[PDB]
Amino acid sequence: NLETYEWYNKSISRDKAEKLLLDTGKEGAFMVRDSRTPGTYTVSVFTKAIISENPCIKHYHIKETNDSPKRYYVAEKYVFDSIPLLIQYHQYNGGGLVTRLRYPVCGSPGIHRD
């Protein structure tokens, strides 16, 4: 039933998804494909934001809930035992985020670092 939408690419591999999206060269070119577990999908989007030798294809998970009937949401591929560990992770890896967490700020008034 997803098969009736232009963006649904069912079976295709990550690598050919990336090739197809790169070739378009259009900002916000995208495709939905299938993920490892059923009920889970993957959005893949072309972007020229982060010049780090442009461009990038971002991949997102679409998880489902345990509802009646069922709901869907965009989330990262990962869960963490701890918020600090989830933060730790995102200092070194962008993940589902635009930039990754380089610099904590404390907003207690009159406070400064080191």
What's the rounded Cα separation, in Å, for the pair 72 and 69? 11
Q: Which helix (H) or strand (E) holds 32?
A: strand 30-34
CA atoms within 13 A on the CB side of 28: 0
What's the rounded Cα separation, in Å, for the pair 95 and 63? 16
